[PDB]
Amino acid sequence: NPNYCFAGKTSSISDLKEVPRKNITLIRGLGHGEVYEGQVPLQVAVKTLPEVCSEQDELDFLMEALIISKFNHQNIVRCIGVSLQSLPRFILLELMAGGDLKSFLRETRPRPSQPSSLAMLDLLHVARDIACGCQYLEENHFIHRDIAARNCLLTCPGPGRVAKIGDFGMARDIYGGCAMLPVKWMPPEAFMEGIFTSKTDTWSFGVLLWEIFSLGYMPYPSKSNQEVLEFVTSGGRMDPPKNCPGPVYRIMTQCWQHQPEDRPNFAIILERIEYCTQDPDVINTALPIEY
Ligand SMILES: Cc1nc([C@](C)(O)CO)sc1-c1cnc(N)c(O[C@H](C)c2cc(F)ccc2N2NC=CN2)c1
């Protein structure tokens, strides 16, 4: 059986909390293995392992269960348990009713029928929440490798929403091909040398900040992966999202410094997000309204 190390402790599949299969009920599909909304009552998201899978798929599934179960932070999705002693195997997560951040931004964009559905403060609160999760990973020497809007979840659709990092698939893989690496979220030393440090997540966080303030656009509009690689290697950076306040765009450009040592750590990023949150010239800026 495979082992896993985090925050000074080694853990094994015996440490995972096995939930009796009879206590688990599936309600509906959420998306793709398949993920279901379920109940244990506790509302859960059920990640399934296909019964027809390779031995490497099984080890990856067991590793992601160990990774998420060992985290303890308000901005990282909770693991309620697993159901590994029955087929198909399950990983049971905290059900984040707000869904994924990329879909939430796309669906909650201000429109004429709702011109204030989202404000600069909502986006700053999401950014702070994920930066708090990243700071926890940084201080525990865990490198995420795929900080992106698609990998973040929201507790609810409303103003009290809390954003959390919900996927650890890329980190699990490293603990396969070029066209699958998230090159649009990677710093130059990562896509060129395969060097990953805490400063890799800083660069990716800058890209997530762009995704958030653009309200869910795909980074580097109209550029392919090779074009992005050539652009970023040459010193090219994204333009500010539409109506993005200068102090927020400044955080993105600091996250995208070519030298990893010139990028801020997450403590500095949180200080800057907090300053943006306090600045009336920032939070009083209206987001664009999509006709
Ligand atoms: C309730 C809910 N609604 C979602 C939609 C369908 O994407 C709409 O936002 S995700 C979601 C949803 C809610 N809570 C979860 N714990 C969850 O975990 C799954 C494994 C997940 C975690 C992520 F970090 C990113 C994507 C996904 N999904 N999403 C689709 C397949 N895996 C998904």
Tab-separated table of C-alpha atoms and ligand atoms in Angstrom:
chain	number	residue	atom	x	y	z
A	1	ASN	CA	0.000	0.000	0.000
A	2	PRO	CA	1.302	3.537	-0.873
A	3	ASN	CA	2.509	6.101	1.741
A	4	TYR	CA	2.164	9.925	1.930
A	5	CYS	CA	4.026	12.623	3.967
A	6	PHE	CA	2.642	16.082	5.092
A	7	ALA	CA	3.296	18.615	7.959
A	8	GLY	CA	5.669	16.249	9.809
A	9	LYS	CA	3.407	13.180	9.644
A	10	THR	CA	3.410	10.067	7.429
A	11	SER	CA	0.039	8.553	6.558
A	12	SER	CA	-1.301	5.486	4.815
A	13	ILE	CA	-4.665	4.249	3.357
A	14	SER	CA	-5.380	2.841	6.904
A	15	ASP	CA	-5.647	6.450	8.183
A	16	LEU	CA	-8.437	7.340	5.688
A	17	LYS	CA	-11.906	7.381	7.265
A	18	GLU	CA	-13.881	4.489	5.687
A	19	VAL	CA	-17.569	5.327	5.404
A	20	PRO	CA	-19.947	2.325	5.236
A	21	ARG	CA	-21.188	1.923	1.631
A	22	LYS	CA	-24.811	1.424	2.883
A	23	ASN	CA	-24.738	4.922	4.438
A	24	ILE	CA	-23.946	6.561	1.028
A	25	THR	CA	-26.690	7.552	-1.435
A	26	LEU	CA	-26.104	9.145	-4.863
A	27	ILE	CA	-28.505	11.958	-5.855
A	28	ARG	CA	-27.383	13.375	-9.247
A	29	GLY	CA	-24.410	13.766	-11.590
A	30	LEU	CA	-22.275	16.927	-11.342
A	31	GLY	CA	-19.679	16.311	-14.057
A	32	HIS	CA	-16.475	14.435	-14.923
A	33	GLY	CA	-14.129	9.772	-13.470
A	34	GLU	CA	-17.709	10.826	-12.669
A	35	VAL	CA	-18.580	13.105	-9.754
A	36	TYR	CA	-21.971	12.896	-8.035
A	37	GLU	CA	-23.874	14.916	-5.491
A	38	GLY	CA	-24.593	12.516	-2.620
A	39	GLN	CA	-25.636	12.090	0.999
A	40	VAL	CA	-24.134	10.249	3.950
A	41	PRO	CA	-27.592	13.865	6.687
A	42	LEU	CA	-24.235	15.097	5.356
A	43	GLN	CA	-24.349	16.575	1.832
A	44	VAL	CA	-21.328	15.345	-0.160
A	45	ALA	CA	-19.633	15.440	-3.568
A	46	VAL	CA	-18.672	11.870	-4.526
A	47	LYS	CA	-15.600	11.427	-6.651
A	48	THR	CA	-15.636	7.919	-8.212
A	49	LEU	CA	-12.897	5.670	-9.502
A	50	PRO	CA	-13.995	3.833	-12.727
A	51	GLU	CA	-14.139	0.062	-12.076
A	52	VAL	CA	-12.319	-0.410	-15.409
A	53	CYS	CA	-9.028	1.364	-14.685
A	54	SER	CA	-5.274	0.832	-14.746
A	55	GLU	CA	-3.170	0.192	-11.595
A	56	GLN	CA	-1.723	3.726	-11.971
A	57	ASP	CA	-5.266	5.233	-11.982
A	58	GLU	CA	-5.978	3.362	-8.698
A	59	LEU	CA	-2.754	4.650	-7.071
A	60	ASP	CA	-3.489	8.225	-8.222
A	61	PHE	CA	-7.032	7.992	-6.748
A	62	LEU	CA	-5.680	6.675	-3.413
A	63	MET	CA	-3.004	9.409	-3.355
A	64	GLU	CA	-5.547	12.236	-3.885
A	65	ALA	CA	-7.626	10.817	-0.992
A	66	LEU	CA	-4.521	10.912	1.288
A	67	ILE	CA	-3.573	14.429	0.099
A	68	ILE	CA	-6.964	16.083	0.742
A	69	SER	CA	-7.622	14.165	4.017
A	70	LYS	CA	-4.312	15.491	5.467
A	71	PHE	CA	-5.126	19.199	4.881
A	72	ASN	CA	-6.823	21.259	7.641
A	73	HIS	CA	-7.666	24.808	6.509
A	74	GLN	CA	-10.883	26.895	5.993
A	75	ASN	CA	-9.960	27.492	2.293
A	76	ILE	CA	-9.274	23.891	1.293
A	77	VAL	CA	-12.196	21.500	0.559
A	78	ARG	CA	-12.846	19.026	3.411
A	79	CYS	CA	-12.742	15.261	2.871
A	80	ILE	CA	-15.584	13.630	4.828
A	81	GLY	CA	-14.113	10.176	4.111
A	82	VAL	CA	-13.758	7.458	1.458
A	83	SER	CA	-15.487	4.177	0.506
A	84	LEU	CA	-12.588	2.077	-0.757
A	85	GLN	CA	-13.873	-1.352	0.364
A	86	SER	CA	-16.611	-1.421	-2.326
A	87	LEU	CA	-16.615	-0.915	-6.104
A	88	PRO	CA	-16.653	1.662	-7.569
A	89	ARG	CA	-14.361	3.298	-5.015
A	90	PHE	CA	-15.410	6.710	-3.683
A	91	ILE	CA	-13.763	9.836	-2.261
A	92	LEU	CA	-16.306	11.847	-0.270
A	93	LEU	CA	-15.847	15.629	-0.254
A	94	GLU	CA	-17.590	18.621	1.328
A	95	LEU	CA	-20.406	19.615	-1.142
A	96	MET	CA	-19.667	23.179	-2.262
A	97	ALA	CA	-23.179	24.372	-3.346
A	98	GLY	CA	-21.792	27.404	-5.219
A	99	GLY	CA	-20.046	25.051	-7.650
A	100	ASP	CA	-16.743	25.755	-9.398
A	101	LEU	CA	-15.342	29.292	-9.559
A	102	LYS	CA	-14.925	29.393	-13.378
A	103	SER	CA	-18.649	28.465	-13.929
A	104	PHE	CA	-19.774	30.800	-11.112
A	105	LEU	CA	-17.971	33.800	-12.682
A	106	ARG	CA	-19.410	33.014	-16.129
A	107	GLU	CA	-22.985	32.552	-14.797
A	108	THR	CA	-22.937	35.446	-12.263
A	109	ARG	CA	-21.483	38.148	-14.640
A	110	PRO	CA	-23.434	41.442	-14.311
A	111	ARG	CA	-26.143	41.755	-17.006
A	112	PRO	CA	-28.868	44.424	-17.743
A	113	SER	CA	-31.397	42.195	-15.875
A	114	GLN	CA	-28.947	42.168	-12.839
A	115	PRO	CA	-26.291	44.947	-13.187
A	116	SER	CA	-24.955	44.541	-9.641
A	117	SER	CA	-24.982	40.692	-9.334
A	118	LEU	CA	-21.223	40.944	-8.559
A	119	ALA	CA	-19.042	43.798	-7.344
A	120	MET	CA	-15.253	44.373	-6.960
A	121	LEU	CA	-15.590	43.383	-3.224
A	122	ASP	CA	-17.024	39.911	-4.127
A	123	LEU	CA	-14.007	39.272	-6.386
A	124	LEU	CA	-11.547	40.579	-3.785
A	125	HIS	CA	-13.116	38.257	-1.148
A	126	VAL	CA	-12.757	35.238	-3.519
A	127	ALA	CA	-9.082	36.269	-4.250
A	128	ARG	CA	-8.340	36.619	-0.487
A	129	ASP	CA	-9.969	33.232	0.275
A	130	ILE	CA	-7.840	31.337	-2.321
A	131	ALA	CA	-4.675	33.307	-1.333
A	132	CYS	CA	-5.298	32.207	2.308
A	133	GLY	CA	-5.465	28.555	1.086
A	134	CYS	CA	-2.272	29.095	-0.960
A	135	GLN	CA	-0.485	30.655	2.079
A	136	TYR	CA	-1.430	27.545	4.121
A	137	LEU	CA	0.058	25.272	1.354
A	138	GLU	CA	3.188	27.503	1.138
A	139	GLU	CA	3.828	27.431	4.881
A	140	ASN	CA	3.387	23.605	4.849
A	141	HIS	CA	5.801	23.339	1.849
A	142	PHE	CA	3.125	21.884	-0.489
A	143	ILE	CA	3.254	23.070	-4.128
A	144	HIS	CA	-0.151	22.990	-5.806
A	145	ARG	CA	1.084	23.278	-9.478
A	146	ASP	CA	-2.384	24.071	-10.883
A	147	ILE	CA	-3.869	27.128	-9.109
A	148	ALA	CA	-6.700	27.952	-11.556
A	149	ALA	CA	-10.368	28.986	-11.443
A	150	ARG	CA	-11.495	25.524	-12.629
A	151	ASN	CA	-9.894	24.035	-9.452
A	152	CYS	CA	-11.677	26.350	-6.972
A	153	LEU	CA	-15.142	25.883	-5.410
A	154	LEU	CA	-17.682	28.124	-3.625
A	155	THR	CA	-19.707	27.226	-0.500
A	156	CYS	CA	-22.812	29.092	-1.814
A	157	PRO	CA	-23.911	31.431	-4.692
A	158	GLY	CA	-24.637	34.380	-2.318
A	159	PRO	CA	-22.582	37.160	-0.656
A	160	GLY	CA	-21.467	34.976	2.252
A	161	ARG	CA	-19.703	32.581	-0.171
A	162	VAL	CA	-16.323	31.176	0.831
A	163	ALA	CA	-13.888	30.145	-1.943
A	164	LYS	CA	-11.722	27.017	-1.454
A	165	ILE	CA	-9.150	25.070	-3.440
A	166	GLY	CA	-11.066	21.909	-4.426
A	167	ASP	CA	-8.783	19.892	-6.716
A	168	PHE	CA	-5.259	18.469	-6.210
A	169	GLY	CA	-4.953	16.328	-9.409
A	170	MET	CA	-1.730	17.885	-10.772
A	171	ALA	CA	0.122	17.690	-7.427
A	172	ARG	CA	-0.998	14.037	-7.075
A	173	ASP	CA	0.465	13.228	-10.551
A	174	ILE	CA	3.911	14.582	-9.567
A	175	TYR	CA	3.894	13.053	-6.021
A	176	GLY	CA	0.667	12.351	-19.145
A	177	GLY	CA	1.643	14.729	-21.952
A	178	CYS	CA	2.606	18.286	-23.052
A	179	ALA	CA	-0.842	19.363	-24.436
A	180	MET	CA	-2.330	18.525	-21.003
A	181	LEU	CA	0.056	20.638	-18.840
A	182	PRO	CA	-1.640	23.897	-17.810
A	183	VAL	CA	0.960	26.061	-19.655
A	184	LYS	CA	-1.246	29.210	-19.386
A	185	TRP	CA	-0.954	29.030	-15.555
A	186	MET	CA	2.797	28.171	-15.423
A	187	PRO	CA	5.856	30.384	-14.870
A	188	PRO	CA	8.824	30.117	-17.285
A	189	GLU	CA	11.077	27.981	-15.035
A	190	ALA	CA	8.179	25.471	-14.631
A	191	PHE	CA	7.377	24.878	-18.366
A	192	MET	CA	11.079	25.205	-19.395
A	193	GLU	CA	13.034	23.398	-16.633
A	194	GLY	CA	10.366	21.492	-14.724
A	195	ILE	CA	11.355	23.517	-11.633
A	196	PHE	CA	8.579	23.866	-9.112
A	197	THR	CA	8.953	25.866	-5.855
A	198	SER	CA	6.447	27.910	-3.714
A	199	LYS	CA	7.024	30.727	-6.261
A	200	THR	CA	5.331	28.531	-8.943
A	201	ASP	CA	1.984	28.973	-7.096
A	202	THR	CA	2.565	32.744	-6.883
A	203	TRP	CA	2.728	32.984	-10.710
A	204	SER	CA	-0.378	30.763	-11.105
A	205	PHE	CA	-2.234	32.842	-8.487
A	206	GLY	CA	-1.614	35.938	-10.661
A	207	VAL	CA	-3.256	34.107	-13.579
A	208	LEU	CA	-6.196	33.059	-11.316
A	209	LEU	CA	-6.520	36.779	-10.281
A	210	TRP	CA	-6.854	37.635	-13.995
A	211	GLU	CA	-9.498	34.899	-14.410
A	212	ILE	CA	-11.434	36.326	-11.432
A	213	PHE	CA	-11.276	40.032	-12.477
A	214	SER	CA	-12.044	39.135	-16.128
A	215	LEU	CA	-15.203	37.312	-14.801
A	216	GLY	CA	-14.215	33.868	-16.097
A	217	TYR	CA	-12.417	34.423	-19.404
A	218	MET	CA	-9.800	31.956	-20.625
A	219	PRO	CA	-6.304	33.474	-20.037
A	220	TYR	CA	-4.281	34.907	-22.984
A	221	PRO	CA	-7.297	35.480	-25.259
A	222	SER	CA	-6.864	33.932	-28.760
A	223	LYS	CA	-3.404	32.501	-27.979
A	224	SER	CA	-2.656	28.806	-28.162
A	225	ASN	CA	-0.373	27.016	-25.604
A	226	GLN	CA	2.765	27.394	-27.818
A	227	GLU	CA	1.971	31.060	-28.454
A	228	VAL	CA	1.600	31.620	-24.685
A	229	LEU	CA	4.884	29.804	-24.025
A	230	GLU	CA	6.681	32.048	-26.594
A	231	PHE	CA	4.886	35.190	-25.389
A	232	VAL	CA	5.622	34.688	-21.638
A	233	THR	CA	9.259	33.514	-22.304
A	234	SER	CA	9.770	36.828	-24.252
A	235	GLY	CA	8.484	38.968	-21.354
A	236	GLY	CA	4.890	39.228	-22.592
A	237	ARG	CA	2.161	39.681	-19.961
A	238	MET	CA	-1.648	39.866	-20.074
A	239	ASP	CA	-3.350	43.266	-20.303
A	240	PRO	CA	-5.655	44.198	-17.399
A	241	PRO	CA	-9.137	42.643	-17.510
A	242	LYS	CA	-11.943	45.056	-18.491
A	243	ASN	CA	-12.415	47.791	-15.806
A	244	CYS	CA	-9.745	46.201	-13.563
A	245	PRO	CA	-8.534	48.741	-10.992
A	246	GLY	CA	-4.778	49.529	-11.244
A	247	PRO	CA	-3.910	48.313	-7.696
A	248	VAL	CA	-5.409	44.861	-8.546
A	249	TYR	CA	-3.618	44.658	-11.916
A	250	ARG	CA	-0.389	45.576	-10.000
A	251	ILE	CA	-0.740	42.406	-7.893
A	252	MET	CA	-1.013	40.341	-11.106
A	253	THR	CA	2.128	41.971	-12.640
A	254	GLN	CA	4.089	41.385	-9.360
A	255	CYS	CA	2.985	37.656	-9.418
A	256	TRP	CA	4.276	37.493	-13.039
A	257	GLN	CA	7.886	38.654	-12.329
A	258	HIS	CA	10.327	36.610	-14.470
A	259	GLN	CA	12.604	35.848	-11.540
A	260	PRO	CA	10.919	33.685	-8.865
A	261	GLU	CA	12.766	35.651	-6.131
A	262	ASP	CA	11.107	38.905	-7.358
A	263	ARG	CA	7.546	37.410	-6.971
A	264	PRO	CA	5.740	38.072	-3.640
A	265	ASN	CA	5.067	35.243	-1.182
A	266	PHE	CA	1.396	34.686	-0.185
A	267	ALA	CA	1.717	36.826	3.019
A	268	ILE	CA	2.570	39.850	0.834
A	269	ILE	CA	-0.198	38.971	-1.699
A	270	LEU	CA	-2.761	38.879	1.159
A	271	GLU	CA	-1.532	42.265	2.452
A	272	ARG	CA	-2.000	43.758	-1.044
A	273	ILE	CA	-5.463	42.173	-1.502
A	274	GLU	CA	-6.441	43.592	1.926
A	275	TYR	CA	-5.203	47.069	0.877
A	276	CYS	CA	-7.338	46.818	-2.359
A	277	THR	CA	-10.356	45.810	-0.232
A	278	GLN	CA	-9.931	48.982	1.889
A	279	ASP	CA	-9.322	51.366	-1.057
A	280	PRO	CA	-12.599	53.097	-2.102
A	281	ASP	CA	-11.124	53.853	-5.560
A	282	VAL	CA	-10.901	50.042	-6.052
A	283	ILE	CA	-14.194	48.700	-4.580
A	284	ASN	CA	-16.286	51.597	-5.964
A	285	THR	CA	-15.294	50.555	-9.553
A	286	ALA	CA	-18.224	49.024	-11.408
A	287	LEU	CA	-17.678	45.724	-13.166
A	288	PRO	CA	-18.592	45.688	-16.883
A	289	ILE	CA	-22.160	44.717	-17.765
A	290	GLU	CA	-22.469	42.046	-20.445
A	291	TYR	CA	-25.297	42.878	-22.866
B	1	LIG	C1	-22.020	21.482	-6.927
B	1	LIG	C2	-20.982	21.574	-7.972
B	1	LIG	N1	-21.365	22.069	-9.208
B	1	LIG	C3	-20.361	22.089	-10.059
B	1	LIG	C4	-20.450	22.526	-11.475
B	1	LIG	C5	-21.280	21.513	-12.238
B	1	LIG	O1	-19.180	22.555	-12.130
B	1	LIG	C6	-21.101	23.885	-11.595
B	1	LIG	O2	-20.326	24.879	-10.937
B	1	LIG	S1	-18.884	21.531	-9.381
B	1	LIG	C7	-19.655	21.193	-7.883
B	1	LIG	C8	-18.865	20.603	-6.803
B	1	LIG	C9	-19.143	20.849	-5.468
B	1	LIG	N2	-18.426	20.367	-4.425
B	1	LIG	C10	-17.357	19.582	-4.713
B	1	LIG	N3	-16.582	19.072	-3.646
B	1	LIG	C11	-17.001	19.263	-6.019
B	1	LIG	O3	-15.875	18.455	-6.174
B	1	LIG	C12	-15.574	18.048	-7.512
B	1	LIG	C13	-14.698	16.816	-7.411
B	1	LIG	C14	-14.835	19.152	-8.207
B	1	LIG	C15	-13.856	19.842	-7.483
B	1	LIG	C16	-13.182	20.912	-8.077
B	1	LIG	F1	-12.252	21.585	-7.384
B	1	LIG	C17	-13.469	21.284	-9.388
B	1	LIG	C18	-14.423	20.577	-10.127
B	1	LIG	C19	-15.126	19.519	-9.536
B	1	LIG	N4	-16.118	18.897	-10.323
B	1	LIG	N5	-17.036	19.651	-10.963
B	1	LIG	C20	-17.505	18.821	-11.901
B	1	LIG	C21	-16.841	17.593	-11.804
B	1	LIG	N6	-15.944	17.657	-10.813
B	1	LIG	C22	-17.775	19.779	-7.066
